[PDB]
């Protein structure tokens, strides 16, 4: 998955 940015 993606890195959390919000």
């Amino acid at each position, epitope marked *: *998955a*993606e*890195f*959390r*940015h*919000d």
Partner: antibody
Amino acid sequence: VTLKESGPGILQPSQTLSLTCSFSGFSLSTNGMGVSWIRQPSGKGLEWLAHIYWDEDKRYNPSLKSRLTISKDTSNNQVFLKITNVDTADTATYYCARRRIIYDVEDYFDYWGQGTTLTVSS
Amino acid sequence: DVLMTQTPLSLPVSLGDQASISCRSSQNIVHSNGNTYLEWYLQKPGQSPKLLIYKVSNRFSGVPDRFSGSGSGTDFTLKISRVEAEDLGVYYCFQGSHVPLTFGAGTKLELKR
């Protein structure tokens, strides 16, 4: 804003590394705030290790997520990283950088420590 | 795992030349919130790295506009017009959209002679 890594330089294969990052100029309870750890072998590239957020969320480099544990001491402005069962491959300089999110205009690694050194050898 | 591959790996320049640095990702790096987290870092010997560009084309506060970054999707460039002795060092591009977060092997900005 500053950061300073401390920890044992030199461990032996399989021992546990416990690394400390003492920061200031910011606070890990500040909405969006976070620190991560990045290490770099001699004459080589940067490898990102793990990252911890203000809401205690965490995120690990999956190829190591297992030998890694990240944690904070909000009250005492500190961030720790533990690597279990180390080996010569973990020989490197370890940095901690700050990185905040929510607002994309602050979302980057603006501040890094001076870096601390580890050699794994028997 | 996004592989960032930079070019050249060494770049000899004369003080006051222009210099480009290409960086291409092994796959698209536009996060699902719409932001492309491409960043450039510069490291001098014995220093830590320091942030030059973020979000592809944005200069970080304190960075001379003689540095500029371009790119889209999977293909990115750093340009330095009028290179200065303080610009000599190693340049890493970085993507921060996918886990794990990753940097290039870095490019060595060196002096011509």
